[PDB]
Amino acid sequence: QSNPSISDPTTLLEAERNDPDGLGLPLKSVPEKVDAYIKKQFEIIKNLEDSVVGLNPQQFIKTDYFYRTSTIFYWIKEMARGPNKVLLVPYLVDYVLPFLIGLVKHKDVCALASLDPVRLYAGLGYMPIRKNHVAAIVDYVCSSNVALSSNQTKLQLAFIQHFLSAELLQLTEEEKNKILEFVVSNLYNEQFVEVRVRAASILSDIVHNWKEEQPLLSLIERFAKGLDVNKYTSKERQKLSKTDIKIHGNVLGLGAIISAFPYVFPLPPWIPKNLSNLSSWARTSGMTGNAAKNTISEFKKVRADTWKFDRASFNTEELEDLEGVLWRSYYA
Amino acid sequence: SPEGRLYQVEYALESISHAGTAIGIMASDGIVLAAERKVTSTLLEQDTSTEKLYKLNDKIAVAVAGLTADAEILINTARIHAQNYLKTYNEDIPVEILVRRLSDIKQGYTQHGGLRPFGVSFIYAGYDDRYGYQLYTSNPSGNYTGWKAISVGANTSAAQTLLQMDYKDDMKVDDAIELALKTLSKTTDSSALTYDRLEFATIRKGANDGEVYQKIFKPQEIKDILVKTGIT
Amino acid sequence: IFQVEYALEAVKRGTCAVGVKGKNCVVLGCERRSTLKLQDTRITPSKVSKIDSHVVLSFSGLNADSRILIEKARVEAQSHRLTLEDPVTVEYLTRYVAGVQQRYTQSGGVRPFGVSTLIAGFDPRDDEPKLYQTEPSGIYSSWSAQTIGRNSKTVREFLEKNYDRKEPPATVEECVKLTVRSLLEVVQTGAKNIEITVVKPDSDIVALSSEEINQYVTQIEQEKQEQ
Amino acid sequence: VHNKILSSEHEKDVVGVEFGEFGIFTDDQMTFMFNRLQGHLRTDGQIHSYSRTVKPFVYAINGSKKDRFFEKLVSLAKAIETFIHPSNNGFWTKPNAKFVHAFIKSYHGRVKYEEDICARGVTNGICLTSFCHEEIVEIFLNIISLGSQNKNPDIANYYISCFAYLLELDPSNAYLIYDKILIDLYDTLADQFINSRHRI
Amino acid sequence: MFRNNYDGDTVTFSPTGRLFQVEYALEAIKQGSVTVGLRSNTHAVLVALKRNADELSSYQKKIIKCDEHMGLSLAGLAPDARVLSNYLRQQCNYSSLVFNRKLAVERAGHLLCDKAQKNTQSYGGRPYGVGLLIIGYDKSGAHLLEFQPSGNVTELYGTAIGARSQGAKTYLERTLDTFIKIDGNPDELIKAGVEAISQSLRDESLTVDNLSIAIVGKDTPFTIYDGEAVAKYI
Amino acid sequence: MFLTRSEYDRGVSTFSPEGRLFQVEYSLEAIKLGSTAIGIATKEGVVLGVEKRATSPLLESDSIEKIVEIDRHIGCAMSGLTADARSMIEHARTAAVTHNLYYDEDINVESLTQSVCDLALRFGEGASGEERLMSRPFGVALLIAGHDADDGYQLFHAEPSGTFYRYNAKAIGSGSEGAQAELLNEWHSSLTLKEAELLVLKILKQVMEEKLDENNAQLSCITKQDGFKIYDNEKTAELIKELKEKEAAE
């Protein structure tokens, strides 16, 4: 019922011409009387959220709420495959992504009736999205209602990392920002240490296509203000490194930036001077001083073959300052 | 081994559908073996080889479809298992036990993947007083299977069809000698079948009593039974 | 080093295999394509394999691969009776089998087994049914019931929604009643496709024939159509 | 459209096809083909003979309204950057090479067709300027230098053959290329690469 | 970029005459914590900085007793030192049993050199990846040795190996004529070993859990001070 | 998005230009990707808990043995390839009895642990000097916890690499990076066994983002008095019920 078979070639091309995207008509468009059916099946499942008011994984597979939900899922899996993708898009922003993240609706219930939601939600980062649909999707992620979810946070954060790779060069510098200001608002979220790190690993995917030097050099500064110099004397760094979140973020962040320029064949002098600011911190055992050792070993490694040479842009006998850095249990 | 596949095996399992062509037919009171001979030159000495039909013991024999130098390495060790089961239990070795003994060495390489699998596929024809006359098969897969009638090698898929057609359970032994030759009508790349492209064998209810004679045909005896129709 | 998962694939493709615990009895079931017209019927009906007088074992996989297990086990089964005078316990026979598929990865660097196996029976004296499952990795698990093999997922789904611990199939007869239904789902003809064995307390293993299997299928599809 | 606009008969019934920023393409039409080509070189490797796939991008350049396009080409080179690196081989190393060559054949292709026309009096501001040849070198130089050291010698001969095409444009940049190539060579004859076969 | 063709294994000489696989191991030294060693005419001291994992974990031991007259400290790959410190423990205990003779320090030097060398001739095995400072009092005075995984064992008055080894290696270089004259004083030679290891720390602060010290000589058998025993030197 | 790659990734038992043995640096990341496991030490005992993760009503949990006895005074919990640790345990049980025979005393937890590390320290296919007969690093991490009379109650982390640390409380497996930073917050030198029985649950609740029962958690402890017992499902439950309440406090 999605074939658009129109009256005339002329009647047709006049529809394609007058479309919002300088592009064309959604090829295959699900006809209203059906957009109604589907919307129902999602909002029938929202009606039944009382059905599992408090049951367990065993008294779950037996409820009607599950049965519906399972069918809807198997359906989504089969829309995202093949020629039906352009049909599935309009529903993501309001229906399909609020669903799926039916996952704090129980992690162990998925292991039972073997369903991989994580793998589908994120596998929907790539796909035939259109200029105007991007808008509403970036707005759904980067939600001001975000704070709602919990370690399903490291999920929306991985969906973004994929969208970006498949909508890069197609995102208006406006959107390219709504994203980056969300990612960065996570290097700081009290509670989950899990995510402050998945955020930084992602902030680099951004700062790789970001060669313009004033968006860049204005971050570097934003981060290295929370640390720079011996703002605090030794005894304090130890105390802070273990608890302070505003500083975990600042070092996770400044860490990602450096790990976003893997092979600049002759080395930018902002990197030495900013590993130096990172070395007095990877000398502290704690939680941030740890993810600052990551950042210096990650680096010293990829620079490995270009190192015969990179050595020379480290006047700073803060070459020494980079020797500890990697420690596992097998070293002493 | 990507999809659940035995690669180095299919390699040699289809290298088999190239060389040779062998047949086995179990009658109610006998068994029959038969093979076609590799691309022959005028000057190759016909009578000597017995190159694809080997005796294992006075009551068991195999037809081969595969690399000769490869099956001899197997047969040599199977003629021995036979005799070890004699010196040990003073009874003649039971057919299934010999078959399994080989199939287990074949599968030995199908897994200790540090040495190369076996060419060769066997039809075994044997008699033991536990399970009347028997017919068995042995691909380098490691598997063996029971058969009232069977074939291995080139043009395999084809003969299996004629066989399925002319076979009857009440079959005598001479009736099955024909069915074997008759259906190397088709499955012969050589237009017209000669006594020299052949090798034959029988395990009958003895030339006398209630017992078991074994008989690898001499060339002349073939041109004699070929006489029954084939060529004359 | 990943080759493990590949073998676990061959499991999938092979003769489908099942098993089902009872109030005091146990059952297996499994096999493949009737007869390719011309094959010998009476000389490889070796579906389920006897390990001791009280312990049995079926498998999904490369038939030519099982044999190497169904022996190394049939042997340690005696070599336990011999050096400890005490039939192997179903957990131990199982732990020994699984422990062998395991050592077929991590040393020398050799290929792992193309079989999952199910292992059933009653410990010696004790009359509490035991059922276990092994897989090419080295993992053994106990099941109130299970299946592994081809279209094994259809069956594991069937069973979950048909077995309950609260009331296990007490009757000898009825415990088979169930194991049949669960293979009819995946077969490819019916009774002529997959057969079964049955072990009851104290070394009383009585495998089922063709004629007892069709006083079942044709007493199932009776109650079936009645709507 | 480009061919017809120049010299000949600027018409065929309509010079009512305007060029501008991005060839004959909308803002969103261009935007789309860029993120699709990036899709090809980074994710889905879906292209064949690239000479054909590159055309639209070359013949959408406007000598007097480039800028907004070169902005889009640069961010496409900065994306693609890591995937050329000699030790990141994958399903992509073919597409990036067969493209970075197909594109610089199909650009020099155009230039030497226009310079054949400004030997007929007709400049046209649509034409490619000395300053396009400059920003083309700025973009694909680290990219070409990384590819040429690649482990596959065929996939390298593609990036290496681009030096000849760039130098024919006699850009102001010419020195940047002669500078690398001559150090790389003088180092090699002084055995400073003796540990690494490929550099030599 | 710049690939290497002669860094595959240890059985392979680089064209310029270099065993890359060994130079790489010689670098694993610097991947572990800093330790210091020095000797007068009457004693030999070791100072190591035990490093921890969490605030919630023990500290890696960095000094191991070898006989009542000889001990060593490690900087680098732990298991490799467990393996070598053990071999040393044997020869020491064999020179005791067969010849009733404390095993010379100068000789355990020669014996480890040859042990590590074996792992740089052989295809398959990697070189040893740890450095050792070895101390002892033998029939010939106080002694200190540096063991790099290359086999090169060298006898010194003082040295330091590892993470920021360079801070102490330069202190000792200047203190030389001062500390080798700290005879007959034990507490004072450790005061020096600790004032040297602390040139290789940043804003970092030695505690009862950071510090590990060992000493030996004339009439002091090899003893190790961890925990509260080390407080008096902070 | 983008791709970072060194030329010395892969390399089996050969040094990177830094002195890193990436084959084993990776052996160590796969602990972070298995079952969760948590150990805490009091002066009144040591507690080990894990995540069961039952995948059916059929499969009768308890063939899920992720916590096992070693001697009556030493237990261990495992995260990872439970099947790959069969041999690692056999060697520890064998070493602990062997010590009891040769010496008429229970074997020190420190030395029982080191002995298990000395086993996975025989990784390789080519060794001259002393032979290390096996094939790959041992693909499983261990929390080993017990009691000897020299050094009180103890907790240890045995890594595949052959080395170890003695944590006063440690977490390994899927949740570790987070569970660990939570233990680092809530542990004191003065816990009671009752108090830690519960803190192990609170931290399993957290980094499982789920509500827990005896079908997905197994608790065990080791006291001087009663030895090393694994809590049967009943006791694990009114220990859970006892938290549902304690946290409804505020």
Curated annotation (Swiss-Prot), chain B:
Compartments, record wording: Cytoplasm; Nucleus
Transmembrane parts of this sequence: none
Main localization (coarse): cytoplasm
Keywords: Cytoplasm, Isopeptide bond, Nucleus, Proteasome, Ubl conjugation
Pfam families in alphabetical order: Proteasome, Proteasome_A_N
GO cellular component, one term: proteasome core complex, alpha-subunit complex
Reported function: The proteasome degrades poly-ubiquitinated proteins in the cytoplasm and in the nucleus. It is essential for the regulated turnover of proteins and for the removal of misfolded proteins. The proteasome is a multicatalytic proteinase complex that is characterized by its ability to cleave peptides with Arg, Phe, Tyr, Leu, and Glu adjacent to the leaving group at neutral or slightly basic pH. It has an ATP-dependent proteolytic activity.
Miscellaneous comment as given in the Swiss-Prot or TrEMBL entry: Present with 17100 molecules/cell in log phase SD medium.
Family membership: Belongs to the peptidase T1A family.
Protein name (record): Proteasome subunit alpha type-3
Organism: Saccharomyces cerevisiae (strain ATCC 204508 / S288c)
From Swiss-Prot, chain C:
Main subcellular location: cytoplasm
Entry keyword Phosphoprotein: yes
InterPro entries in the cross-refs: Ntn_hydrolases_N (IPR029055), Proteasome_alpha (IPR050115), Proteasome_alpha-type (IPR023332), Proteasome_asu_N (IPR000426), Proteasome_bsu_CS (IPR016050), Proteasome_sua/b (IPR001353)
Modification sites for Phosphothreonine: T44
Gene3D superfamilies: Glutamine Phosphoribosylpyrophosphate, subunit 1, domain 1
Alphabetical UniProt keywords: Cytoplasm, Nucleus, Phosphoprotein, Proteasome
Superkingdom of source: Eukaryota
GO biological process: proteasomal ubiquitin-independent protein catabolic process; proteasome-mediated ubiquitin-dependent protein catabolic process
Cell compartments where the protein resides: Cytoplasm; Nucleus
Bridged cysteine pairs (disulfide): none
Assigned GO CC terms: mitochondrion; nuclear outer membrane-endoplasmic reticulum membrane network; nucleus; proteasome complex; proteasome core complex, alpha-subunit complex; proteasome storage granule
Family: Belongs to the peptidase T1A family.
Primary role: The proteasome degrades poly-ubiquitinated proteins in the cytoplasm and in the nucleus. It is essential for the regulated turnover of proteins and for the removal of misfolded proteins. The proteasome is a multicatalytic proteinase complex that is characterized by its ability to cleave peptides with Arg, Phe, Tyr, Leu, and Glu adjacent to the leaving group at neutral or slightly basic pH. It has an ATP-dependent proteolytic activity.
PANTHER family: PROTEASOME SUBUNIT ALPHA/BETA
Other remarks on this protein: Present with 16800 molecules/cell in log phase SD medium.
Name recorded for this polypeptide: Proteasome subunit alpha type-4
Gene giving rise to this polypeptide: PRE6
Swiss-Prot record, chain D:
Highest taxon listed in the record's lineage: Eukaryota
Signal peptide annotation: none
UniProt subcellular location: Nucleus; Cytoplasm
Note: Present with 2600 molecules/cell in log phase SD medium.
Protein family per UniProt: Belongs to the BLM10 family.
Subunit-level organization: According to PubMed:12973301, colocalizes with nascent proteasome. According to PubMed:15778719, associates with proteasome core particles and also forms a complex with regulatory particle-core particle (RP-CP).
Domain notes: The bromodomain-like (BRDL) region specifically recognizes and binds acetylated histones.
Function as written in the Swiss-Prot or TrEMBL entry: Associated component of the proteasome that specifically recognizes acetylated histones and promotes ATP- and ubiquitin-independent degradation of core histones during DNA damage response. Recognizes and binds acetylated histones via its bromodomain-like (BRDL) region and activates the proteasome by opening the gated channel for substrate entry. Binds to the core proteasome via its C-terminus, which occupies the same binding sites as the proteasomal ATPases, opening the closed structure of the proteasome via an active gating mechanism.
Protein name (record): Proteasome activator BLM10
Species this protein is from: Saccharomyces cerevisiae (strain ATCC 204508 / S288c)
Parent-protein residues present: 439 to 638 of 2143
From Swiss-Prot, chain E:
Keyword field contains Nucleus: yes
Residues modified to Phosphoserine: S14
UniProt signal peptide: none
A single Gene Ontology CC term: nucleus
Chief place where the protein resides: cytoplasm
Listed GO biological process terms: proteasomal ubiquitin-independent protein catabolic process; proteasome-mediated ubiquitin-dependent protein catabolic process
Compartment annotation: Cytoplasm; Nucleus
Cross-link entry Glycyl lysine isopeptide (Lys-Gly) (interchain with G-Cter in ubiquitin), positions: K191
Family: Belongs to the peptidase T1A family.
Self-association and partners: The 26S proteasome consists of a 20S proteasome core and two 19S regulatory subunits. The 20S proteasome core is composed of 28 subunits that are arranged in four stacked rings, resulting in a barrel-shaped structure. The two end rings are each formed by seven alpha subunits, and the two central rings are each formed by seven beta subunits. The catalytic chamber with the active sites is on the inside of the barrel.
Remarks, miscellaneous: Present with 7210 molecules/cell in log phase SD medium.
Protein name: Proteasome subunit alpha type-6
Organism of derivation: Saccharomyces cerevisiae (strain ATCC 204508 / S288c)
Gene (UniProt): PRE5
